[PDB]
Amino acid sequence: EAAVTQSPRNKVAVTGGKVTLSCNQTNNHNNMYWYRQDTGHGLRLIHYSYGAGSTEKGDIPDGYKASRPSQENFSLILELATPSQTSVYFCASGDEGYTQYFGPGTRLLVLEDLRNVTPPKVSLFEPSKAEISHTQKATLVCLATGFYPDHVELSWWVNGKEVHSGVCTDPQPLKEQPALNDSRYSLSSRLRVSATFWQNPRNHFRCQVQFYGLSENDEWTQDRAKPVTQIVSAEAWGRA
Amino acid sequence: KNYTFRCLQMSSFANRSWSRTDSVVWLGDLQTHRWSNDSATISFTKPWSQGKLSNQQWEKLQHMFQVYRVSFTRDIQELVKMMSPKEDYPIEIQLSAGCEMYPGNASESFLHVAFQGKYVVRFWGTSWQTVPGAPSWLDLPIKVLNADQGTSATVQMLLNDTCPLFVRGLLEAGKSDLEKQEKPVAWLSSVPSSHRQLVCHVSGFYPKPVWVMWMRGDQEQQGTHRGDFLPNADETWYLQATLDVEAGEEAGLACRVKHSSLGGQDIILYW
Amino acid sequence: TQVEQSPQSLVVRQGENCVLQCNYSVTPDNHLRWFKQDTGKGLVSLTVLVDQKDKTSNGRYSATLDKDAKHSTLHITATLLDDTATYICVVGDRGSALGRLHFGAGTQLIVIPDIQNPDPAVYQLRDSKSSDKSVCLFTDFDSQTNVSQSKDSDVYITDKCVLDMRSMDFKSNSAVAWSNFACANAFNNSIIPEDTFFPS
Amino acid sequence: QKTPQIQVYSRHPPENGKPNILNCYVTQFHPPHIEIQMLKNGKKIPKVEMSDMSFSKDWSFYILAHTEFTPTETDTYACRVKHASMAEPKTVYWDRDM
Ligand SMILES: CCCCCCCCCCCCCCCCCCCCCCCCCC(=O)N[C@@H](CO[C@H]1O[C@H](CO)[C@H](OCc2ccccc2)[C@H](O)[C@H]1O)[C@H](O)[C@H](O)CCCCCCCCCCCCCC
Ligand SMILES: *[C@@H]1O[C@H](CO[C@@H]2O[C@@H](C)[C@@H](O)[C@@H](O)[C@@H]2O)[C@@H](O[C@@H]2O[C@H](CO)[C@@H](O)[C@H](O)[C@H]2NC(C)=O)[C@H](O)[C@H]1NC(C)=O
Ligand SMILES: *[C@@H]1O[C@H](CO)[C@@H](O[C@@H]2O[C@H](CO)[C@@H](O)[C@H](O)[C@H]2NC(C)=O)[C@H](O)[C@H]1NC(C)=O
Ligand SMILES: *[C@@H]1O[C@H](CO)[C@@H](O[C@@H]2O[C@H](CO)[C@@H](O)[C@H](O)[C@H]2NC(C)=O)[C@H](O)[C@H]1NC(C)=O
Ligand SMILES: [Cl-]
Ligand code: NA
Ligand code: NA
């Protein structure tokens, strides 16, 4: 199980800003590789390295600098970020064999300006009594609203542990003001459980939205709170 | 009469971009194939260069090599990047491959690789390996080339089966060219050398084995210095034997030449 | 591009088989690898084909390769909902790290799930903190029903979505609608089943 | 980086006025990039055939340049070789006596 990690996993950056995508690998692989994934294309190689100190140009190196300071770490550096570098970036490693072991991916969005960036409000809607008696099932509904851009990860948590069973989230967020250019987004998710499970008042339910926005170092001139990368969640306890 | 078959390859890499690869193939001292960088296909230099392979068998084989040449060029380029900055351009690589045919359907194949004019690597058994004298950095190239199982299986089949089969066919198809007998012509001349030096020229003979001695009557001169075998353009050989003597001593000396083509009637040239 | 996949996308019902095609011009062609990419996630290797006329299998996934034709197919037997993914074909031109990988653009598979016993209904759910606010949950309808957006732009309706309560082996469609409006008049623009339960 | 040996010789016994082939055999050189000219009275002969380059067991390169010529008492024939190993080009004149 030769695993590879990437950080960050999701990033919002401004044009002309510096962005550094990192890749760690503990498998003692000499060889590491950087790809980006775009619609209409397969993965395309940007930069690769045969060992610490070496960097070699791929097929689409323009706009990127690579860096292999150690055997473990391989970085992709966007010196001056541009909207065209909006993509999903995959790192990989391998030994002398043909197999490349891929990381989980990094989603990068490069905006013209950060003025419209805003975190979500989150509301948890409790199951209806009608549904409970009719199905012997209880559907919680989470609602993330008023956020920009659309880089959010909505997750469900029961008693401090993440639940996947009985969950589905909108494949993409809908626009609140489709007419406007920089519309805020809304996202919904449902968690269905048995009525008896929801009826247990020791079960603590929480909808968590991981918002990706500005960092500490990003400049901010507006009066409202700085729309930084953050979590917003809503919660409720079970009841008979 | 053990004929050695040699597939000689020369590859030159001036920098990252520019490179060229040219090959020639010898069965004994006769050229059978030529492959210029410029050419997309292997060229016969004899009527019988295809041997006893069918057109279909030759196409398959040629295609294998066509892929090889392109692949090899990129591999060396990548291997340089891998060792960088330990090794740098310009780089010269040579390959000597083929099989040595013995009687009784016996042979022994080989694949030797030189780097910057030094024999560093060979294919032995079922893998690439370094030879004594090789620098230790080549162990990463060798590890990488030995990762490629497909290349290993192919070269194994190429050295073990394809070479002896093909060369055994060549020997049948090119029998009359291999066993040909070309007669030498001889001529005499002299120059000073610190005392004059008599030169006996012998040119246009095939095959390579030849006997040339200066003689006074029936007295083999011990001072006869045989030179190297120099080739002619028509695939015949040139040899000269020199004898250092004193002025006024040239009278009596003759150059005797024995060769299989002459068949008893040795050439005897008197000064 | 040296690696073309077909079809570009396809839709199948749960239980059905599908065949995915990969055609390449890569020279040489050492090996061919099939990946699975769930929406958002990374690349999961399904199988790898190496021989001239190779065949492989991985549970429900089986594949073949013909190097003479430069053709490979991935067969998925008895599709499940979780097969909803992009399937990516990659050819490697070496049997070592000296190789470059040649990637296909992918094939999008959607698997429409089999809803066992439908029970369509529209419920009203209340916010845990501020009880005045609410959403409308249209749920437990079959796959043949289509949820359209509202005429009013102040009313928001999501696309339909399917969840899977794994322990019970139960699946259900749902869509959410909200505004700032009643649930009775929420999904009017959608053609909903006539036996749709509207509670009091 | 080995330095090239050069050897000039005629195919047939040399007779004045009588057509013949003149050979230039360059050997023992490395690297294989080389320029070989055959000269008549210091001027470059046109249409000089060149054998394909090859190498011996010791990995040293060789090549046989040859051309048609008619020897006279006046005309001088030579072989001029430029190689990276040599600072200046090495010229080797033909001598029928040698
Ligand atoms: C050799 C005797 C032949 C006698 C018979 C024929 C005679 C007729 C005249 C022909 C004249 C030809 C002139 C050329 C003569 C010199 C060449 C002699 C040496 C032959 C070597 C051929 C190598 C063949 C393989 C090859 O092309 N490798 C290529 C391509 O390989 C790919 O494509 C294959 C398709 O066949 C296969 O995939 C198919 C496959 C997959 C799975 C299973 C089975 C198959 C492989 O797996 C896949 O990786 C590969 O790139 C090799 O690495 C090339 C380099 C090999 C020589 C390296 C020498 C050592 C160099 C050391 C460097 C040190 C310096 C570093 C800075
Ligand atoms: C091919 O033959 C080799 C043995 O022949 C030697 O290596 C060739 C490449 C060539 O250089 C010949 O002249 C040599 O005599 C086989 O190698 C042996 O394989 C066995 C089993 O795989 C292994 O146990 C031995 O260690 C190998 N022998 C040596 C000396 O290393 C090889 O298996 C043959 N391959 C095929 C496909 O026929
Ligand atoms: C790579 O090397 C080649 C071959 O040496 C270079 O081409 C030569 O360039 C010089 C000029 O400095 C000329 O005198 C030669 O005639 C050229 N030779 C050939 C065969 O073209 C080439 O410029 C080099 N390329 C790079 C990018 O460095
Ligand atoms: C030797 O042959 C190779 C392979 O044909 C040449 O590489 C090609 O060069 C041409 C012209 O520069 C390009 O159009 C092709 O894209 C190249 N092909 C490949 C596969 O790389 C190489 O230039 C030749 N070298 C010399 C010095 O003639
Ligand atoms: Cl891409
Ligand atoms: Na979750
Ligand atoms: Na219901």
Side-chain angles (χ1 to χ4, degrees), chain A residues 37 42 48 95-98 100 107 123-126 128 131 134 139 165-166 168 170 176 190 192 235, chain C residues 31 33 37 40 96-97 100-101 104 119 123-128 140 156 158 161-162 164 166 172 174:
Chain A
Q37 183 177 55
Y48 64 98
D95 58 26
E96 61 267 13
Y98 56 72
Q100 293 183 7
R107 300 206 208 177
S123 287
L124 176 55
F125 296 86
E126 297 183 8
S128 84
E131 188 196 358
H134 194 87
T139 304
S165 177
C168 102
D170 300 344
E176 294 183 342
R190 318 97 173 115
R192 198 170 211 173
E235 52 106 326
Chain C
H31 70 276
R33 188 184 294 281
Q37 190 171 25
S96 77
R100 296 288 173 91
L101 302 180
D119 190 11
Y123 305 105
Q124 193 176 119
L125 291 67
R126 301 206 157 280
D127 188 5
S128 68
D140 289 37
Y156 303 106
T158 70
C161 183
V162 54
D164 190 0
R166 294 198 176 282
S172 62
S174 61

Short mmCIF file of all heavy atoms in Angstrom, two decimals, chain A residues 37 42 48 95-98 100 107 123-126 128 131 134 139 165-166 168 170 176 190 192 235, chain C residues 31 33 37 40 96-97 100-101 104 119 123-128 140 156 158 161-162 164 166 172 174:
data_model
loop_
_atom_site.label_atom_id
_atom_site.label_comp_id
_atom_site.label_asym_id
_atom_site.label_seq_id
_atom_site.Cartn_x
_atom_site.Cartn_y
_atom_site.Cartn_z
N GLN A 37 -5.68 17.54 -14.50
CA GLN A 37 -6.83 16.92 -15.15
C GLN A 37 -7.82 18.02 -15.55
O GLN A 37 -8.24 18.81 -14.71
CB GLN A 37 -7.48 15.90 -14.23
CG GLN A 37 -8.65 15.15 -14.87
CD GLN A 37 -9.24 14.10 -13.97
OE1 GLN A 37 -9.63 14.36 -12.84
NE2 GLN A 37 -9.31 12.88 -14.48
N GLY A 42 -7.20 13.69 -21.07
CA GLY A 42 -6.68 12.83 -20.03
C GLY A 42 -5.71 13.59 -19.15
O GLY A 42 -5.48 14.78 -19.38
N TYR A 48 8.28 16.36 -13.75
CA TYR A 48 8.62 15.14 -13.03
C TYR A 48 10.06 15.22 -12.52
O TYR A 48 10.83 16.10 -12.92
CB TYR A 48 8.37 13.90 -13.90
CG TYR A 48 9.22 13.80 -15.14
CD1 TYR A 48 10.36 13.00 -15.16
CD2 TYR A 48 8.89 14.47 -16.30
CE1 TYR A 48 11.14 12.89 -16.30
CE2 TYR A 48 9.66 14.37 -17.45
CZ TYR A 48 10.79 13.57 -17.45
OH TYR A 48 11.56 13.45 -18.57
N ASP A 95 8.84 3.56 -8.26
CA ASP A 95 10.22 3.09 -8.27
C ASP A 95 10.63 2.87 -9.74
O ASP A 95 10.20 3.61 -10.61
CB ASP A 95 10.38 1.87 -7.35
CG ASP A 95 9.49 0.69 -7.70
OD1 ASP A 95 9.10 0.55 -8.88
OD2 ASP A 95 9.18 -0.09 -6.77
N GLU A 96 11.47 1.86 -10.00
CA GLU A 96 12.01 1.60 -11.33
C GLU A 96 10.94 0.95 -12.23
O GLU A 96 11.08 0.95 -13.45
CB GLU A 96 13.26 0.72 -11.25
CG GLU A 96 13.04 -0.65 -10.62
CD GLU A 96 13.29 -0.74 -9.12
OE1 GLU A 96 13.40 0.32 -8.47
OE2 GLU A 96 13.38 -1.87 -8.61
N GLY A 97 9.89 0.38 -11.62
CA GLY A 97 8.78 -0.24 -12.34
C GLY A 97 7.90 0.78 -13.04
O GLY A 97 8.08 1.99 -12.88
N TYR A 98 6.92 0.29 -13.81
CA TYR A 98 6.09 1.15 -14.66
C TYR A 98 4.91 1.74 -13.87
O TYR A 98 4.29 2.70 -14.33
CB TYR A 98 5.60 0.39 -15.90
CG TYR A 98 4.84 -0.90 -15.65
CD1 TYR A 98 3.55 -0.89 -15.16
CD2 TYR A 98 5.41 -2.13 -15.96
CE1 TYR A 98 2.84 -2.06 -14.95
CE2 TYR A 98 4.71 -3.31 -15.77
CZ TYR A 98 3.43 -3.28 -15.26
OH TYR A 98 2.74 -4.44 -15.06
N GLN A 100 2.78 3.88 -11.44
CA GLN A 100 2.75 5.17 -10.74
C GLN A 100 1.56 5.16 -9.77
O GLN A 100 0.43 4.90 -10.18
CB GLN A 100 2.63 6.33 -11.74
CG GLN A 100 3.85 6.51 -12.63
CD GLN A 100 3.72 7.71 -13.54
OE1 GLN A 100 2.77 8.48 -13.45
NE2 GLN A 100 4.67 7.87 -14.44
N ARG A 107 -7.82 20.30 -5.86
CA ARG A 107 -8.67 21.20 -6.63
C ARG A 107 -8.20 22.64 -6.42
O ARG A 107 -8.24 23.15 -5.30
CB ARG A 107 -10.14 21.05 -6.21
CG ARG A 107 -10.71 19.65 -6.39
CD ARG A 107 -12.22 19.67 -6.58
NE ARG A 107 -12.86 18.45 -6.13
CZ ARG A 107 -14.18 18.24 -6.12
NH1 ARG A 107 -14.99 19.13 -6.67
NH2 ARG A 107 -14.67 17.15 -5.56
N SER A 123 -27.82 25.49 8.06
CA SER A 123 -29.02 25.16 8.82
C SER A 123 -29.29 23.66 8.71
O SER A 123 -29.15 23.08 7.63
CB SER A 123 -30.21 25.95 8.34
OG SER A 123 -30.11 27.31 8.74
N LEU A 124 -29.66 23.04 9.84
CA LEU A 124 -30.08 21.65 9.90
C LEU A 124 -31.59 21.61 10.13
O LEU A 124 -32.08 22.15 11.12
CB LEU A 124 -29.33 20.93 11.03
CG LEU A 124 -29.75 19.48 11.29
CD1 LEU A 124 -29.64 18.65 10.02
CD2 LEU A 124 -28.90 18.86 12.39
N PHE A 125 -32.31 20.96 9.21
CA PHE A 125 -33.75 20.81 9.29
C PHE A 125 -34.07 19.41 9.84
O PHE A 125 -33.58 18.41 9.32
CB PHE A 125 -34.38 21.10 7.92
CG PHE A 125 -34.17 22.52 7.45
CD1 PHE A 125 -33.01 22.88 6.78
CD2 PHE A 125 -35.11 23.50 7.73
CE1 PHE A 125 -32.81 24.19 6.37
CE2 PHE A 125 -34.91 24.81 7.31
CZ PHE A 125 -33.76 25.15 6.64
N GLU A 126 -34.89 19.38 10.90
CA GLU A 126 -35.21 18.16 11.63
C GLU A 126 -36.30 17.38 10.89
O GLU A 126 -37.16 17.98 10.25
CB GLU A 126 -35.65 18.48 13.06
CG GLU A 126 -34.58 19.16 13.89
CD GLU A 126 -34.98 19.43 15.34
OE1 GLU A 126 -36.05 18.96 15.76
OE2 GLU A 126 -34.20 20.12 16.04
N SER A 128 -39.68 15.41 9.79
CA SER A 128 -41.10 15.65 10.03
C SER A 128 -41.72 14.42 10.69
O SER A 128 -41.33 13.28 10.41
CB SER A 128 -41.82 16.00 8.75
OG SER A 128 -42.19 14.83 8.04
N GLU A 131 -43.39 11.93 8.16
CA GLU A 131 -42.45 10.97 7.56
C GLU A 131 -42.20 9.80 8.52
O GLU A 131 -42.22 8.65 8.11
CB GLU A 131 -41.13 11.66 7.21
CG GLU A 131 -40.19 10.77 6.41
CD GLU A 131 -38.74 11.23 6.35
OE1 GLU A 131 -38.43 12.31 6.91
OE2 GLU A 131 -37.92 10.51 5.74
N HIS A 134 -45.12 7.44 8.82
CA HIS A 134 -45.50 6.91 7.50
C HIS A 134 -44.48 5.87 7.00
O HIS A 134 -44.86 4.92 6.32
CB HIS A 134 -45.69 8.05 6.50
CG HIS A 134 -46.38 7.65 5.24
ND1 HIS A 134 -47.76 7.64 5.13
CD2 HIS A 134 -45.91 7.24 4.05
CE1 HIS A 134 -48.10 7.25 3.92
NE2 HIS A 134 -46.98 7.00 3.23
N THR A 139 -35.53 11.65 7.91
CA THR A 139 -34.60 12.34 7.02
C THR A 139 -34.27 13.72 7.60
O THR A 139 -35.15 14.58 7.71
CB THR A 139 -35.16 12.48 5.60
OG1 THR A 139 -35.49 11.18 5.11
CG2 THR A 139 -34.20 13.14 4.64
N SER A 165 -23.26 6.10 5.05
CA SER A 165 -24.50 5.37 4.82
C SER A 165 -25.70 6.29 5.03
O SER A 165 -25.76 7.02 6.02
CB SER A 165 -24.58 4.15 5.71
OG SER A 165 -25.82 3.48 5.54
N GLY A 166 -26.64 6.26 4.08
CA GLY A 166 -27.89 6.99 4.15
C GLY A 166 -27.72 8.47 3.85
O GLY A 166 -28.57 9.27 4.23
N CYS A 168 -26.81 11.54 0.82
CA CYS A 168 -26.56 11.99 -0.54
C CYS A 168 -26.57 13.52 -0.57
O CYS A 168 -27.40 14.16 0.08
CB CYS A 168 -27.57 11.39 -1.52
SG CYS A 168 -28.90 12.52 -2.03
N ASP A 170 -26.10 17.11 -3.16
CA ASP A 170 -26.29 17.63 -4.51
C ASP A 170 -24.96 17.52 -5.26
O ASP A 170 -23.92 17.91 -4.74
CB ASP A 170 -26.77 19.08 -4.50
CG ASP A 170 -28.09 19.31 -3.80
OD1 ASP A 170 -28.81 18.32 -3.57
OD2 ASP A 170 -28.40 20.47 -3.48
N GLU A 176 -27.94 31.23 -6.43
CA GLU A 176 -29.03 31.91 -5.72
C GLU A 176 -29.61 33.03 -6.59
O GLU A 176 -30.81 33.30 -6.54
CB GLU A 176 -28.52 32.46 -4.38
CG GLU A 176 -28.13 31.37 -3.39
CD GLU A 176 -27.69 31.86 -2.02
OE1 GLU A 176 -27.36 33.05 -1.88
OE2 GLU A 176 -27.68 31.03 -1.08
N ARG A 190 -28.95 15.36 2.42
CA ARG A 190 -29.90 14.63 3.25
C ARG A 190 -29.17 13.48 3.96
O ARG A 190 -28.23 12.91 3.41
CB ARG A 190 -31.06 14.07 2.42
CG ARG A 190 -31.62 15.03 1.37
CD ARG A 190 -31.02 14.76 0.00
NE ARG A 190 -31.65 15.54 -1.06
CZ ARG A 190 -31.03 16.48 -1.78
NH1 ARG A 190 -29.80 16.86 -1.46
NH2 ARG A 190 -31.64 17.02 -2.82
N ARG A 192 -30.68 10.11 5.96
CA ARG A 192 -31.82 9.29 6.37
C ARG A 192 -31.36 8.20 7.35
O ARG A 192 -30.38 7.49 7.10
CB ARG A 192 -32.51 8.65 5.16
CG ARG A 192 -33.92 8.17 5.46
CD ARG A 192 -34.70 7.76 4.22
NE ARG A 192 -36.14 7.99 4.36
CZ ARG A 192 -37.02 7.84 3.37
NH1 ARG A 192 -36.63 7.40 2.19
NH2 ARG A 192 -38.29 8.14 3.57
N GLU A 235 -26.32 21.58 14.13
CA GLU A 235 -26.42 20.37 14.95
C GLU A 235 -27.80 20.29 15.61
O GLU A 235 -28.50 21.29 15.75
CB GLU A 235 -25.30 20.34 15.99
CG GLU A 235 -25.19 21.61 16.84
CD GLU A 235 -25.68 21.50 18.27
OE1 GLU A 235 -26.66 20.75 18.51
OE2 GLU A 235 -25.09 22.16 19.15
N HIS C 31 1.85 -2.01 -21.57
CA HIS C 31 0.73 -2.40 -20.73
C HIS C 31 -0.42 -1.39 -20.88
O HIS C 31 -0.20 -0.27 -21.35
CB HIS C 31 1.19 -2.55 -19.28
CG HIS C 31 1.53 -1.25 -18.61
ND1 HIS C 31 2.77 -0.66 -18.75
CD2 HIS C 31 0.81 -0.44 -17.81
CE1 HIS C 31 2.80 0.46 -18.06
NE2 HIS C 31 1.61 0.62 -17.47
N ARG C 33 -3.84 0.00 -18.47
CA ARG C 33 -4.42 0.03 -17.14
C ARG C 33 -5.77 0.76 -17.21
O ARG C 33 -5.89 1.81 -17.83
CB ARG C 33 -3.47 0.74 -16.17
CG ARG C 33 -3.89 0.68 -14.71
CD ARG C 33 -2.98 1.48 -13.80
NE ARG C 33 -1.63 0.93 -13.72
CZ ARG C 33 -1.28 -0.12 -12.98
NH1 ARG C 33 -2.17 -0.71 -12.20
NH2 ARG C 33 -0.04 -0.58 -13.03
N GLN C 37 -12.68 6.55 -11.45
CA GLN C 37 -12.67 7.83 -10.77
C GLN C 37 -14.10 8.19 -10.36
O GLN C 37 -14.92 8.56 -11.20
CB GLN C 37 -12.05 8.92 -11.65
CG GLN C 37 -11.79 10.23 -10.92
CD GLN C 37 -11.00 11.21 -11.74
OE1 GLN C 37 -11.00 11.17 -12.97
NE2 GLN C 37 -10.30 12.12 -11.07
N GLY C 40 -15.15 13.65 -7.99
CA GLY C 40 -14.36 14.43 -7.04
C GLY C 40 -13.09 13.72 -6.60
O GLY C 40 -12.06 14.36 -6.40
N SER C 96 8.91 0.00 -17.54
CA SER C 96 9.76 0.61 -16.52
C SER C 96 9.39 2.08 -16.34
O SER C 96 8.51 2.59 -17.03
CB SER C 96 11.22 0.44 -16.86
OG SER C 96 11.61 1.37 -17.87
N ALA C 97 10.09 2.76 -15.42
CA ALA C 97 9.86 4.16 -15.08
C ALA C 97 10.33 5.10 -16.21
O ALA C 97 10.03 6.29 -16.17
CB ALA C 97 10.56 4.49 -13.79
N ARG C 100 6.37 6.77 -20.45
CA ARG C 100 5.34 7.79 -20.33
C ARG C 100 3.97 7.11 -20.38
O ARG C 100 3.76 6.18 -21.17
CB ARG C 100 5.48 8.83 -21.45
CG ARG C 100 6.78 9.62 -21.41
CD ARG C 100 6.84 10.63 -20.27
NE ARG C 100 8.15 11.26 -20.18
CZ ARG C 100 8.51 12.39 -20.80
NH1 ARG C 100 7.61 13.10 -21.45
NH2 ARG C 100 9.77 12.79 -20.75
N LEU C 101 3.05 7.56 -19.51
CA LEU C 101 1.65 7.12 -19.51
C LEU C 101 0.86 8.00 -20.49
O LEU C 101 1.02 9.22 -20.51
CB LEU C 101 1.07 7.23 -18.10
CG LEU C 101 1.79 6.43 -17.01
CD1 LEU C 101 1.11 6.63 -15.66
CD2 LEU C 101 1.87 4.95 -17.36
N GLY C 104 -6.46 8.34 -21.60
CA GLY C 104 -7.74 8.62 -22.23
C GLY C 104 -8.49 9.71 -21.47
O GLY C 104 -8.22 9.94 -20.29
N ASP C 119 -43.04 5.21 -2.58
CA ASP C 119 -43.99 5.74 -1.61
C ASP C 119 -43.91 7.26 -1.64
O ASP C 119 -43.64 7.90 -0.62
CB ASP C 119 -43.71 5.15 -0.22
CG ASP C 119 -44.77 5.44 0.83
OD1 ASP C 119 -45.86 5.91 0.46
OD2 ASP C 119 -44.50 5.18 2.02
N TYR C 123 -42.89 16.32 2.41
CA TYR C 123 -42.90 16.65 3.83
C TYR C 123 -42.33 18.06 4.05
O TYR C 123 -41.62 18.59 3.20
CB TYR C 123 -42.08 15.63 4.62
CG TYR C 123 -42.49 14.20 4.43
CD1 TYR C 123 -41.74 13.33 3.66
CD2 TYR C 123 -43.63 13.70 5.04
CE1 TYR C 123 -42.11 12.01 3.49
CE2 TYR C 123 -44.01 12.38 4.88
CZ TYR C 123 -43.25 11.53 4.10
OH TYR C 123 -43.62 10.23 3.94
N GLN C 124 -42.66 18.64 5.21
CA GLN C 124 -42.10 19.91 5.65
C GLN C 124 -41.19 19.65 6.87
O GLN C 124 -41.63 19.07 7.86
CB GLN C 124 -43.22 20.90 6.00
CG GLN C 124 -42.72 22.32 6.18
CD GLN C 124 -43.84 23.30 6.42
OE1 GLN C 124 -43.90 23.96 7.45
NE2 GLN C 124 -44.74 23.41 5.45
N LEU C 125 -39.93 20.09 6.75
CA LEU C 125 -38.93 19.96 7.81
C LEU C 125 -38.63 21.35 8.37
O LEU C 125 -38.64 22.33 7.62
CB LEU C 125 -37.67 19.30 7.23
CG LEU C 125 -37.80 17.83 6.83
CD1 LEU C 125 -38.75 17.65 5.65
CD2 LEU C 125 -36.44 17.25 6.49
N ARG C 126 -38.36 21.43 9.68
CA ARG C 126 -38.18 22.71 10.39
C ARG C 126 -36.74 22.84 10.89
O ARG C 126 -36.15 21.87 11.35
CB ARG C 126 -39.18 22.81 11.54
CG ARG C 126 -40.64 22.73 11.10
CD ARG C 126 -41.60 23.43 12.05
NE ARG C 126 -42.83 23.80 11.36
CZ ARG C 126 -42.97 24.87 10.58
NH1 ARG C 126 -41.95 25.68 10.38
NH2 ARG C 126 -44.12 25.11 9.99
N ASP C 127 -36.20 24.07 10.81
CA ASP C 127 -34.84 24.39 11.25
C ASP C 127 -34.75 24.21 12.77
O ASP C 127 -35.63 24.66 13.51
CB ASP C 127 -34.45 25.81 10.83
CG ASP C 127 -32.99 26.19 11.05
OD1 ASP C 127 -32.21 25.31 11.47
OD2 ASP C 127 -32.65 27.36 10.80
N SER C 128 -33.67 23.55 13.22
CA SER C 128 -33.48 23.13 14.61
C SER C 128 -33.40 24.33 15.56
O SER C 128 -33.80 24.23 16.72
CB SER C 128 -32.25 22.26 14.74
OG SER C 128 -31.07 23.01 14.51
N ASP C 140 -38.99 9.47 -1.97
CA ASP C 140 -39.48 8.09 -2.10
C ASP C 140 -40.27 7.90 -3.40
O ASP C 140 -41.21 7.10 -3.45
CB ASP C 140 -40.28 7.66 -0.87
CG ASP C 140 -39.43 7.45 0.38
OD1 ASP C 140 -38.47 8.22 0.56
OD2 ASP C 140 -39.74 6.51 1.15
N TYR C 156 -36.35 27.89 -4.70
CA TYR C 156 -35.21 27.06 -5.09
C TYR C 156 -35.60 25.59 -4.98
O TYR C 156 -36.18 25.18 -3.99
CB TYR C 156 -34.00 27.37 -4.21
CG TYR C 156 -33.57 28.81 -4.21
CD1 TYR C 156 -33.83 29.63 -3.12
CD2 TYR C 156 -32.93 29.37 -5.31
CE1 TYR C 156 -33.45 30.97 -3.12
CE2 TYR C 156 -32.55 30.70 -5.32
CZ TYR C 156 -32.81 31.50 -4.22
OH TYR C 156 -32.43 32.81 -4.23
N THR C 158 -33.72 21.66 -5.86
CA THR C 158 -32.51 20.94 -6.22
C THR C 158 -32.85 19.87 -7.26
O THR C 158 -34.02 19.54 -7.46
CB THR C 158 -31.86 20.29 -4.99
OG1 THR C 158 -32.68 19.21 -4.55
CG2 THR C 158 -31.63 21.26 -3.85
N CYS C 161 -31.80 13.27 -6.22
CA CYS C 161 -30.61 12.65 -5.65
C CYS C 161 -31.00 11.35 -4.95
O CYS C 161 -32.06 11.28 -4.33
CB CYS C 161 -29.94 13.61 -4.68
SG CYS C 161 -28.40 12.97 -3.97
N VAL C 162 -30.14 10.33 -5.04
CA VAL C 162 -30.42 9.00 -4.49
C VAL C 162 -29.44 8.69 -3.36
O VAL C 162 -28.23 8.83 -3.51
CB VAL C 162 -30.39 7.91 -5.58
CG1 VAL C 162 -29.09 7.90 -6.38
CG2 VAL C 162 -30.66 6.53 -4.99
N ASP C 164 -28.52 5.71 -0.09
CA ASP C 164 -28.48 4.27 0.12
C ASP C 164 -28.23 3.99 1.60
O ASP C 164 -27.11 4.14 2.09
CB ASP C 164 -27.42 3.62 -0.78
CG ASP C 164 -27.45 2.10 -0.82
OD1 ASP C 164 -28.31 1.49 -0.15
OD2 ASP C 164 -26.60 1.52 -1.54
N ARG C 166 -27.37 1.44 3.70
CA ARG C 166 -26.67 0.21 3.31
C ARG C 166 -27.11 -0.98 4.17
O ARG C 166 -27.36 -2.06 3.64
CB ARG C 166 -25.15 0.41 3.39
CG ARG C 166 -24.60 1.42 2.39
CD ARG C 166 -23.10 1.29 2.20
NE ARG C 166 -22.60 2.19 1.16
CZ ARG C 166 -22.72 1.98 -0.15
NH1 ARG C 166 -23.37 0.92 -0.60
NH2 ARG C 166 -22.17 2.83 -1.00
N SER C 172 -33.56 5.38 -1.91
CA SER C 172 -34.66 6.34 -2.05
C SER C 172 -34.18 7.61 -2.76
O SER C 172 -33.12 8.14 -2.44
CB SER C 172 -35.25 6.68 -0.70
OG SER C 172 -34.30 7.30 0.14
N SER C 174 -34.81 11.68 -3.68
CA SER C 174 -35.29 12.85 -2.96
C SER C 174 -34.89 14.13 -3.70
O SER C 174 -33.94 14.14 -4.49
CB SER C 174 -34.78 12.86 -1.54
OG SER C 174 -33.36 12.91 -1.51
#
